[PDB]
Each structure stands twice: as C-alpha cells, then as structure tokens.
Design an enzyme around this catalytic site. Structure first.
Site, PDB file in Angstrom:
ATOM      1  N   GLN A  40      50.796 177.999 130.977  1.00 47.08           N
ATOM      2  CA  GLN A  40      49.410 178.390 130.795  1.00 47.08           C
ATOM      3  C   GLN A  40      48.466 177.201 130.872  1.00 47.08           C
ATOM      4  O   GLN A  40      47.263 177.408 131.004  1.00 47.08           O
ATOM      5  CB  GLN A  40      49.241 179.100 129.455  1.00 47.08           C
ATOM      6  CG  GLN A  40      49.383 178.169 128.247  1.00 47.08           C
ATOM      7  CD  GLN A  40      49.230 178.916 126.929  1.00 47.08           C
ATOM      8  OE1 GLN A  40      50.172 179.544 126.462  1.00 47.08           O
ATOM      9  NE2 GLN A  40      48.021 178.890 126.349  1.00 47.08           N
ATOM     10  N   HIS A  79      49.762 182.061 118.442  1.00 47.21           N
ATOM     11  CA  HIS A  79      50.297 181.883 119.785  1.00 47.21           C
ATOM     12  C   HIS A  79      51.073 183.134 120.134  1.00 47.21           C
ATOM     13  O   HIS A  79      52.009 183.489 119.415  1.00 47.21           O
ATOM     14  CB  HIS A  79      51.219 180.677 119.856  1.00 47.21           C
ATOM     15  CG  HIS A  79      51.707 180.369 121.237  1.00 47.21           C
ATOM     16  ND1 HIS A  79      50.849 180.164 122.296  1.00 47.21           N
ATOM     17  CD2 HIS A  79      52.954 180.153 121.716  1.00 47.21           C
ATOM     18  CE1 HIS A  79      51.551 179.883 123.380  1.00 47.21           C
ATOM     19  NE2 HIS A  79      52.831 179.867 123.057  1.00 47.21           N
ATOM     20  N   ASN A 136      58.320 181.463 126.371  1.00 42.69           N
ATOM     21  CA  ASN A 136      57.061 180.807 126.110  1.00 42.69           C
ATOM     22  C   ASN A 136      56.361 180.564 127.440  1.00 42.69           C
ATOM     23  O   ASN A 136      56.934 180.750 128.516  1.00 42.69           O
ATOM     24  CB  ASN A 136      57.298 179.504 125.352  1.00 42.69           C
ATOM     25  CG  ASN A 136      56.070 179.032 124.610  1.00 42.69           C
ATOM     26  OD1 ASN A 136      55.011 179.661 124.670  1.00 42.69           O
ATOM     27  ND2 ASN A 136      56.197 177.907 123.921  1.00 42.69           N
TER      28      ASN A 136
HETATM   29  C1  LIG Z   1      47.205 181.299 122.082  1.00 49.36           C
HETATM   30  C2  LIG Z   1      47.492 180.230 123.128  1.00 49.36           C
HETATM   31  O1  LIG Z   1      46.944 180.311 124.225  1.00 49.36           O
HETATM   32  O2  LIG Z   1      48.284 179.311 122.748  1.00 49.36           O
HETATM   33  C3  LIG Z   1      45.710 181.564 122.010  1.00 49.36           C
HETATM   34  O3  LIG Z   1      45.086 180.528 121.295  1.00 49.36           O
HETATM   35  C4  LIG Z   1      45.421 182.958 121.450  1.00 49.36           C
HETATM   36  O4  LIG Z   1      45.191 183.883 122.216  1.00 49.36           O
HETATM   37  N1  LIG Z   1      45.440 183.070 120.105  1.00 49.36           N
HETATM   38  C5  LIG Z   1      45.185 184.304 119.377  1.00 49.36           C
HETATM   39  C6  LIG Z   1      46.096 184.454 118.176  1.00 49.36           C
HETATM   40  C7  LIG Z   1      47.510 184.902 118.523  1.00 49.36           C
HETATM   41  C8  LIG Z   1      47.445 185.954 119.630  1.00 49.36           C
HETATM   42  C9  LIG Z   1      48.195 185.442 117.269  1.00 49.36           C
HETATM   43  C10 LIG Z   1      43.777 184.264 118.813  1.00 49.36           C
HETATM   44  O5  LIG Z   1      43.338 183.227 118.342  1.00 49.36           O
HETATM   45  N2  LIG Z   1      43.126 185.430 118.877  1.00 49.36           N
HETATM   46  C11 LIG Z   1      41.785 185.636 118.390  1.00 49.36           C
HETATM   47  C12 LIG Z   1      40.735 185.342 119.449  1.00 49.36           C
HETATM   48  C13 LIG Z   1      40.440 183.864 119.627  1.00 49.36           C
HETATM   49  C14 LIG Z   1      39.371 183.342 118.667  1.00 49.36           C
HETATM   50  N3  LIG Z   1      38.039 183.879 118.905  1.00 49.36           N
HETATM   51  C15 LIG Z   1      37.069 183.258 119.579  1.00 49.36           C
HETATM   52  N4  LIG Z   1      35.882 183.861 119.726  1.00 49.36           N
HETATM   53  N5  LIG Z   1      37.236 182.062 120.115  1.00 49.36           N
END
Ligand SMILES: *[C@@H](C(=O)O)[C@H](O)C(=O)N[C@@H](CC(C)C)C(=O)NCCCCNC(N)=[NH2+]
Length: 212
Positions: free
Chosen positions: A19, A159, A175
């Site tokens: 990614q 993640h 992953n």
């Molecule tokens: C994961 C990655 O690419 O390593 C990525 O940070 C992600 O999608 N994280 C998710 C949490 C997991 C799916 C449990 C996440 O943070 N989701 C919420 C949305 C992101 C935060 N919101 C904003 N507006 N930035």
C-alpha cells in the site's frame, strides 16, 4: 471446520501488494476478500482495484484511513473494476469508475463476524478470506519477520488486513506492506489465548463480502 485453512493453496489469494505511504489498508483488506470470494464462486482469480475503493468510498477518508465494511458495501452496491484497468496510485484521486467502463465484479452484500469471538472468526475464514483489523502501530508488529506473532501489542486497532487462513495456533494474515515484510508479506498471529479481543485486537471488527 478443518484444523488448517490456507486460501493461497486454493488459488484464492492474489500476490501481496504494497500500500505504500497511503493509509489505504482498509481498501487493500476489502479487495483481498473480494478477490477471494470471486475465485471461490466463479473459479477465476482476478485482481481488483484498491484504487477504486480509495477514490470512490465517500464514507472513508482516502489515504487518511477508512472502513473495510464501507468499501465492501460499495462493491455490493455498485461493483469493482479489475486492478489492471484501475491501477493503484497510492494517492486519492477522483472516483473514475464511470470512465473505466462496466464493473468487472459485484458482490451481494456484507456481513460482520460476531466480534470478540475466536470461533466465529475461524468459521468465517474456513469459508472465505475475511477482512480483520489489528493494532499494527507497535514496533514488534512492524519489525515482524516470521514465526507465530504473540505481540507484544495492545488492542488499539489501527490497520485493516485480511485473514486468509489459520492453523491450530495461529490465524494467517495477508498484509499490505509488500513481500519483504513478515513471511513473504504474511503474518501468522497466535490464536487461542483466551483473550476475547484477540492478540493485537484481531477479533475487534471483521467483515466479509457475500456473493450468491
Ligand atoms: C490503516 C492503514 O492504511 O495502515 C489505515 O490507517 C486505516 O484505514 N485505519 C482505520 C482503522 C482500522 C481500519 C481499524 C481508521 O483509522 N479508520 C477511521 C478513518 C480514518 C480517520 N479519519 C479521518 N478523517 N482521517
């Protein structure tokens, strides 16, 4: 369900992706389950566009993160293009689904695995790859090079990855950090510790696409 499941041996897993810097794990996670279920149902293994989910899932936040279940809903509601037609750019751009012609695949829906239940997750993995989440921020996860990973890690899940199998003492995870990380891009995470969160919070939030 069997003592061992490995969807790679059933030709249901595409090669490991990287990614990159973009926080698109949620879209990579989603795509693995789509690639897996299309192979299980049609017999063809294809690669689908993480980029499309990244551009087109308005509930998610592009490279700033997102929701596997939201992306899975996108694909059930609309569909997804082949990765070759909608390749990964590592940057959110505008949603180009219409430009790239008809969708290559469509699912029928999205289910959640009942959370905090190890057996419920393994049952689902026996049927198909499952989008799962975990805490990957810890240095031990990031420097993982192989073996059954037990942590240390907490439950601050951050993640999205994809469970593509399991064994007696681990869940097998694809992953999205390239083939150089972990076990050729995979991690085996200890299961059966009686921690209902799962290690690194692996049982917090798991979803799979449904295709009839
Ligand atoms: C994961 C990655 O690419 O390593 C990525 O940070 C992600 O999608 N994280 C998710 C949490 C997991 C799916 C449990 C996440 O943070 N989701 C919420 C949305 C992101 C935060 N919101 C904003 N507006 N930035």
């Amino acid at each position: 369900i069997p003592e061992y499941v490995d969807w790679r041996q059933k030709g249901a897993v595409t090669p490991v992706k990287n990614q990159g810097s973009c926080g698109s794990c949620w879209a990579f996670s989603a795509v693995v389950t789509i690639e897996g279920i299309i192979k299980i149902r049609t017999g063809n293994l294809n690669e689908y566009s993480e980029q499309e989910l990244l551009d087109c899932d308005r509930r998610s936040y592009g490279c700033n993160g997102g929701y596997p279940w939201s992306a899975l809903q996108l694909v059930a509601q609309y569909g997804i293009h082949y990765r070759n037609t909608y390749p990964y750019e590592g940057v959110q751009r505008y949603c180009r689904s219409r430009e790239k012609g008809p969708y290559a695949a469509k699912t029928d829906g999205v289910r959640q695995v009942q959370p905090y239940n190890e057996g419920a997750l393994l049952y689902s993995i026996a049927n198909q790859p499952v989008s799962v989440v975990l805490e990957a921020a810890g240095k031990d996860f990031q420097l993982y090079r192989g073996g059954i990973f037990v942590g240390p890690c907490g439950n601050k899940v951050d993640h999205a990855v994809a469970a593509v199998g399991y064994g007696p003492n681990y869940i097998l995870i694809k992953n999205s950090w390239g083939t150089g990380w972990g076990e050729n891009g995979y991690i085996r995470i200890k299961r059966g510790t009686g921690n209902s969160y799962g290690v690194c919070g692996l049982y917090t939030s798991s979803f799979y696409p449904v295709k009839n």
